[PDB]
Design a protein around this ligand. Structure first.
Ligand SMILES: [Cu+2]
Ligand SMILES: [Cu+2]
Ligand SMILES: [Zn+2]
Ligand SMILES: [Zn+2]
Lengths: 153, 153
């Protein structure tokens, strides 16, 4: 029923439009659209806490985590709300994102509007890397592109 | 107590950083910041409806208008929720934006989080133009710079 869109831009080649659609308030969010300018492989894909690019993607803060828990995969019991896992770019560096998630919302307590969508340099290890960063940001590395998540028509 | 921040960019020289603050949920929103690259004089300053910059500033839509009203000034009972009036750029082309509004909100139904703030090329005539375009957008003309409104720390 209610929708969201997001333009990922950054300092290098990474760009693409990512749409959000949530049919009812408690139901799942569909997350789709394509990202280009990526290296082939897995890339971290998160909603970050703050919708702030005063200083590019770095101002977007840590992973949105209103339930104050640890980082994991999208299917893990232990996850921040923004923990949307990996996207996969192909040989041309095109990641055709098609995602369904029941933990993010476009309304209520876990609402992602006005927060930042970030696509990372490396793979999100899902908390399995065996280091301090792994259980925090998934060791996905730097923030290649972002955008504020905004209400769509 | 709760906070929002917005970064305006366009296809030209106009750029700035606009903060929103609100002490209680019923209370007024302090809107402060600075816009540069502007021509000297008055400039349209509105919260548009859609936090969508896929087509640049255009995809933002018309002025945020839940109460389905006509366009006016922030003083008028006849105002869109997102009619924040004018901003005045100086001889150096810099507007030191400081505005107080009890109508806009950072939580609730008149929520401006995830919508687009726009700075316009011309003065907003505040609905006193004597034309159709006056009572819809304010004859402010083209959209110089914009950005989504995001929750800040
Ligand atoms: Cu991240
Ligand atoms: Cu406008
Ligand atoms: Zn996380
Ligand atoms: Zn208006």
């Amino acid at each position: 029923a209610d929708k969201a869109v997001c333009v990922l831009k950054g300092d290098g080649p990474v760009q693409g439009i990512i749409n959000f659609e949530q049919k009812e308030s408690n139901g799942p969010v569909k997350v789709w659209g394509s990202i280009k300018g990526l290296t082939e492989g897995l890339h971290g894909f998160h909603v970050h806490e703050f919708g702030d690019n005063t200083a590019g993607c770095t101002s977007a803060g840590p992973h949105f985590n209103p339930l104050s828990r640890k980082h994991g995969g999208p299917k893990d019991e232990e996850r921040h709300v923004g923990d949307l896992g990996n996207v996969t770019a192909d040989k041309d560096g095109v990641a055709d994102v098609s995602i369904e998630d029941s933990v993010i919302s476009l309304s209520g307590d876990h609402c992602i509007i006005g927060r930042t969508l970030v696509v990372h340099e490396k793979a999100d290890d899902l908390g399995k890397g065996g280091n301090e960063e792994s259980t925090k940001t998934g060791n996905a590395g730097s923030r290649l592109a972002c955008g504020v998540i905004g209400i769509a028509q």
